[PDB]
Amino acid sequence: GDAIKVFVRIRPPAERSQNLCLSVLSSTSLRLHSNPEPKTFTFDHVADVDTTQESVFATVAKSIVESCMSGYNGTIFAYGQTGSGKTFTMMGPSESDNFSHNLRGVIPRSFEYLFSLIDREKGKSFLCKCSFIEIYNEQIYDLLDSASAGLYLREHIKKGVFVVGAVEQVVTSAAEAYQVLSGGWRNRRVASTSMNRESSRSHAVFTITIESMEKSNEIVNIRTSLLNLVDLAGSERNINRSLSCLGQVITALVDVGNGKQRHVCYRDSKLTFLLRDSLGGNAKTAIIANVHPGSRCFGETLSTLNFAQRAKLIKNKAVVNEDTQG
Ligand SMILES: Nc1ncnc2c1ncn2[C@@H]1O[C@H](COP(=O)(O)OP(=O)(O)O)[C@@H](O)[C@H]1O
Ligand SMILES: [Mg+2]
């Protein structure tokens, strides 16, 4: 198959604290200063503390969206310790309403790009629906409906795992996509301040189904793509168990992809299950690993880099999800 794509993004430390623990050697390479012997890692890209939101999009998402348009499933998720910048990365800063639009993250920029590609693709027609859900403590909540209850996971023949009874909102424009996101991202923030004891333990999954029909009478070709944009629970220890499953799954896959054989429990967590195609399955996956340089993050940084390194070993098999009728 095709190896998944791993990127490392180093967020800048808070202003006015030296002594970094991490040095970027090149656009593919970084050195972790561990003693006595330093380690170096190689990824598809390494972005330093100055990297802009837009840069991130171009390096990571642009490709995924494109292959989405061509009918492949695709997935981007952000992994890393709490406070490493996952949310800033996929979403943007909070709290900034009347300004700093250049700060919006991957997900908003993805909407923009997707819809302009579509606009330009026009015979053929397009249909997009969004879902936004949150997994907290092995438990599902619908961000589009705060009154929803009893959400649960279910397999399909099409191979899709999905959340049964989650709102699927139809959107015809970036702008419409944007309130779906806004409304949900708020519910997420709003729930995190009582409990939902922390937002640092919840995974957030924003999904767009992208379905085109090329229809030249009588015949109709149908392409359908599932795009998952995920902001994970923080990876620090104690280690949240769904993330532990994530580690276990990544590991088993590697044993398998290169030799041996192994059992991979996708069903050990709602996350690994819902993401089953994203790992080793039918989809084009990109992982952004967020790390905070700086010396007191050394341990969690080391874990993140270790995790991401294996992840880069995994291979998916992704096909155009197609169909013909009429
Ligand atoms: N690229 C960046 N540039 C500047 N500040 C950032 C960047 N990424 C994150 N931050 C800031 O660091 C803090 C944690 O980022 P956040 O996205 O909340 O972390 P996480 O989602 O990993 O818990 C926030 O204050 C955030 O605004
Ligand atoms: Mg966060």
- DSSP secondary structure letters along 195-241: SSS-STTEEEEEEEEEEEEEEETTEEEEEEEEEEEEEPPP-PTTT-H
Q: Does ligand 1 come within 6 angstroms of the Cβ of 82?
A: yes
CA distance 240 to 221: 43
Which residue is listed with tokens 């702008």?
175
> Ligand 1, closest atom to CA 93?
27
Burial annotation 91-128 (CB, 10 A radius, 16+ → b, else e): bbeeeeeeeeeeebbbbbbbbbbbbeebeeeeeeebeb
- Beta bridge partners, 129, equal 170, 209
Q: Where are the domains of the chain?
A: 1-326
Q: Does ligand 1 come within 6 angstroms of the Cβ of 88?
A: yes
The answer to the question of whether 86 is labelled as a binding residue is yes
The answer to the question of whether 29 is labelled as a binding residue is no
Closest residue by Cα to atom 15, ligand 1, is 85
The 8-class DSSP code of residue 264 comes to: -
This PDB structure is determined at a resolution in Å of 2.7
The answer to the question of whether 160 is labelled as a binding residue is no
Q: Does ligand 1 come within 6 angstroms of the Cβ of 304?
A: no
Task: Give me 163's structure tokens.
Answer: 């959340």
Please state, in angstroms and as integers, the Cα–Cα distance from residue 54 to each residue in 62, 105, 110, 234, following that order: 10, 8, 11, 24
CA distance 286 to 288: 7
Please state, in angstroms and as integers, the Cα–Cα distance from residue 132 to each residue in 10, 35, 192, following that order: 27, 43, 16
User: Considering just the CA atoms, what is the radius of gyration of the chain in Å?
Assistant: 20
One-letter amino acid for residue 278 of the chain:
S
Q: Which fold does the domain 1-326 belong to in CATH?
A: Kinesin (3.40.850)
Q: How was this structure determined?
A: X-ray
Count of C-beta atoms within a 10 Å radius of residue 298: 17
